[PDB]
Amino acid sequence: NTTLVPCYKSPAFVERMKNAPDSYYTTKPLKAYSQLLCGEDGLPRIALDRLSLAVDVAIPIAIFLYTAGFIGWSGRSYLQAIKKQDKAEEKEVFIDVPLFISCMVMALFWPMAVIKELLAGELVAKDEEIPISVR
Amino acid sequence: XXXXXXXXXXXXXXXXXXXXXXXXXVAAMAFGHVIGVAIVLGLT
């Protein structure tokens, strides 16, 4: 797309700078919006061009997907940590915070943990392990 | 004050409101003020 131009060269967005108070919020952030692909209305936008933004449409996605899996992995690995203890019925209502923290430090390097979960055939339960309905 | 003297209202209470129900274990001298003050303020 070529309708989007940087807020450097955008008549509708310098007008945003002109009538801007400061107070904390419309100078320090608004200078940083000058590097964004900026529409014909003076509004920063998220476009998907090519390698020009191929790293910037990967910083949020890598930061989220890592820490979403980090929450998911620590939460998952804490569940099997207490199923094997045979105490998982009340181990869940009363969080064992030393065990849960030790399951979080296992989840820092979770992307390489899931691979050896998968390559060991251990991440995913086999189909006739799973309670199902009549079907 | 001088006159007023609403001790007649209490005397008309102690000799009348001592025929209540229990009448044992004096509120007529409490009631005689309620009647007494109301009347003297009700005729001034």
């Binding site: 107070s23 904390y24 919020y25 998911g72 939460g75 998952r76 569940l79 099997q80 207490i82 199923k83 998982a88 019925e89 009340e90 181990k91 869940e92 209502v93 009363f94 991440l123 995913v124 339960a125 392990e129 799973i130 309670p131 199902i132 309905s133 | 004050x1 007023x4 209540x20 129900x21 229990x22 009448x23 044992x24 274990x25 509120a27 409490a30 309620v34 003050v37 003297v40 303020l41």
Partner: protein, 751 residues
């Protein structure tokens, strides 16, 4: 014989049971097999009548829990005075209480929400509060923020006493049942020691703090020349230029009370009965006289019942003597038994008491709302139009929730505490024994009013659309005049028997217009056809709310469908799909439906209020005397079609909350959308059932079993009753936040 009897250290004080939640129920205290256990732990936390069985131990929980509740109110009261102390423009608002807007609760600069700190006048940036705290602290005599702060301190230490008193009365000295069951002694102390001494204490404050302080504040002394409230008593000569007809000395100034020469008090205990025209509130001298009259009349009331000195009344056989050898002949139909066995109802069961005490605290809260607009007691209250609406609206809603809760426990009493043997042929049993004639005639009057209130709005909506405004129920078409209410408006203004009240109480009734800061404090509120029709909407919606709630009380025990509805409990979803379907037959499900009807009824009451003030009462006065109302007589002509309600009230008056972005009213715009989300979100729980949702969890539990991440707290969809409770809790939450946002954005955009 009234006595103090207590136990000694009945319940130990340890955290043994904190670590094992659900201990109060044996079913809960065996493990969390499913997530239903989590919700049952909260829906049962306060039902003390199912934790234990003996009334002695139940009543000790009630009494100790009240103390922890009073602690919570004192924490909240402390927060109000603390915010009025160091986060408010209360100092500025005392100097000029017309152009300065009341505001506590400033907003932190983060997330761009500093925009909510709007300009309040005087260079203070905050949020315009509509709680009326400032108008109440001025009437209490507060002048500086140190007095507010030390009252906040005085409330935190007062909350600590409530917490200690609750622990002390459950874990150290818990009273026995004999101490609780002498309700006849409790009435003596609550009537005399609490309400009598409380209003005697307050009229002590009014005369010695509020009356002098508000005397000088009306002459414009600007918070320098205001003496501190104690300097009025340490310097008794200071209150002789004010109220000179008294004497004002320690002993020399009080003896007119004892020698009954009360004429010296006529200058500060007046009976003017109107609105103080410089502030718009009631005369504080007239208020101080009121509390003294109330105090004397409540202390007297507290000597009615018989404690251990023989003299007094016995409620027990005042009730038992309301049989029918001795009644008026026209109401002699209530049984040879009459009221026997009914003193044991209101003594051996707390739900019987809670049902009455809620239905009267709810009705009191609505009465209070009607009285604090028609005769504002606080200085500069009536002119703060955002506070008048938000105080009426708050107390109508609070009063309507409490009324529904009085009908809840009237039904929990029936299916838990109702005893057939003590209630044979008495006044309660004879109601259940004809409960089809009560509901038939309630369901008919609900339906008579439904056509004759709402369907006349659809008559008007159709003649005005046809272009026949001369055959619509207008003031110009077929007039429906409130004949019996315009008569009372005439009675209440010609009586100024009651001759001493030379100033008409409640300018609403008639006579005069009060304009304080140019804005009208109070005007006569005339009644026309639009007020006939809106008052029968009120009658209609109140009746159906009564019909829903009374049906749940009378048919709580049994019906013709389910003769054993009492064994199923108070809170059960249904009795299966038989008999065609018995969904929502419980008494709980009539509280759940009465909550919707309370919402319908009260949201029509506050809409009747909000539009009738903007069109007929509120407004501004120019330099001639004419009043330009906020909407300008809009109610009389356009509130008679419920298209007029949608365009001249809902569409027109929402301009302030719709166009509120990028302004200080921005948060009311978000709440107004937030309330719309929650209402629509509620309908997920109301329109659907948990068979769909449980069968959806199974497909989602499978996706977790596949990745070996299933929980052992098995996910269950919410109960049928739980899902109905969630639906009504969100419908009422969302539908009120949208009304709260709409009222306050409209009236903080004006004044």
């Amino acid at each position: 014989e009234v006595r103090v009897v207590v136990d000694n250290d009945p319940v130990p004080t340890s955290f043994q049971k904190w670590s094992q939640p659900g201990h109060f129920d044996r079913t809960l205290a065996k493990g969390a097999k499913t997530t239903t256990w989590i919700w049952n732990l909260h829906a049962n936390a306060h039902d003390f009548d199912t934790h234990t069985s003996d009334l002695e131990d139940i009543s000790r929980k009630i009494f100790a829990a009240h103390f922890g509740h009073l602690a919570v109110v004192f924490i909240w009261l402390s927060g109000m005075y603390f915010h009025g102390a160091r986060f408010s423009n209360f100092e500025a608002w005392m100097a000029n209480p017309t152009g300065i807007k009341p505001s506590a609760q400033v907003v932190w600069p983060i997330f761009g929400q500093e925009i909510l700190n709007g300009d309040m006048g005087g260079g203070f940036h905050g949020i315009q509060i509509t709680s009326g705290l400032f108008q109440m602290w001025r009437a209490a005599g507060f002048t500086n923020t140190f007095q507010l702060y030390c009252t906040a301190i005085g409330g935190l230490v007062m909350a600590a006493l409530m917490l200690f008193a609750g622990w002390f009365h459950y874990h150290k000295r818990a009273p026995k049942l004999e101490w609780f069951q002498n309700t006849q002694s409790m009435l003596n102390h609550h009537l005399a020691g609490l309400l009598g001494l409380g209003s005697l204490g307050w009229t002590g404050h009014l005369i010695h703090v509020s009356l002098p302080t508000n005397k000088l504040l009306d002459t414009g002394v600007a918070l320098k020349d205001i003496p501190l409230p104690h300097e009025f008593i340490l310097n008794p000569s200071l209150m002789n230029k004010l109220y000179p007809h008294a004497d004002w000395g320690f002993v020399k100034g009080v003896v007119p009370f004892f020698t009954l020469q009360w004429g010296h008090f006529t200058d500060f205990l007046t009976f003017k009965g109107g609105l103080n025209p410089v502030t718009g509130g009631l005369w504080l001298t007239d208020v101080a006289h009121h509390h003294l009259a109330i105090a004397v009349m409540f202390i007297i009331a507290g000597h009615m019942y018989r404690t251990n000195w023989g003299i007094g009344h016995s409620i027990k056989e005042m009730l038992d003597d309301a049989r029918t050898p001795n009644m008026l002949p026209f109401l002699s139909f209530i049984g040879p038994v009459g009221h026997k066995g009914l003193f044991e109802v209101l003594t051996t069961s707390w739900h019987a008491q809670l049902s009455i005490n809620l239905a009267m605290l709810g009705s009191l809260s609505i009465i209070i709302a009607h009285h604090m607009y028609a005769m504002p007691p606080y200085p500069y209250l009536a002119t703060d139009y955002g506070t008048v609406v938000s105080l009426f609206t708050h107390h109508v809603w609070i009063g309507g929730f409490l009324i529904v809760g009085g009908a809840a426990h009237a039904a929990i009493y029936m299916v838990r505490d109702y005893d057939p043997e003590q209630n044979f042929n008495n006044v309660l049993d004879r109601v259940l024994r004809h409960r089809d004639a009560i509901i038939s005639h309630l369901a008919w009057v609900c339906q008579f009013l439904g056509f004759h209130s709402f369907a006349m709005y659809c008559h008007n909506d159709t003649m005005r659309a046809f272009g026949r405004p001369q055959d619509m129920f207008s003031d110009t078409g077929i007039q429906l005049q409130p004949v019996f209410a315009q008569w009372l408006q005439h009675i209440h203004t010609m009586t100024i028997a009651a001759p001493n009240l030379h100033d008409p109480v409640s300018y609403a009734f008639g006579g005069g217009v009060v304009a304080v800061g140019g804005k009208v404090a109070m005007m006569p509120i005339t009644l026309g056809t639009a007020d006939f029709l809106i008052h029968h909407i009120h009658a209609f919606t109140i009746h159906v709310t009564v019909l829903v709630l009374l049906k749940g009380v009378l048919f709580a025990r049994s019906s013709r469908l389910i003769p054993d509805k009492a064994n199923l409990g108070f809170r059960f979803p249904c009795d299966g799909p038989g008999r065609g379907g018995t969904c929502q037959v419980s008494a709980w499900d009539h509280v759940f439906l009465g909550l919707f009807w309370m919402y319908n009824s009260l949201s029509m009451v506050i809409f009747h209020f909000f539009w009738k003030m903007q069109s007929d009462v509120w407004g501004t006065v120019g330099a001639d005397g004419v009043v330009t109302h906020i909407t300008g007589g809009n109610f009389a002509t356009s509130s008679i079609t419920n298209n007029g309600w949608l365009r001249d009230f809902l569409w027109a008056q929402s301009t302030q909350v719709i166009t509120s972005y990028n302004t200080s009213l921005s948060a009311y715009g978000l709440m107004f959308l937030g309330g719309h989300f929650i209402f629509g979100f509620s309908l997920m729980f109301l329109f659907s059932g948990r068979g769909y949702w449980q069968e959806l969890i199974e497909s989602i539990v499978w996706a977790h079993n596949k990745l070996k991440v299933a929980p052992a707290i098995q996910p269950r969809a919410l109960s049928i009753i739980h899902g109905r409770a969630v639906g009504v809790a969100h419908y009422l939450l969302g539908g009120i936040v949208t009304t709260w946002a709409f009222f306050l954005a409209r009236m903080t955009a004006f004044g």
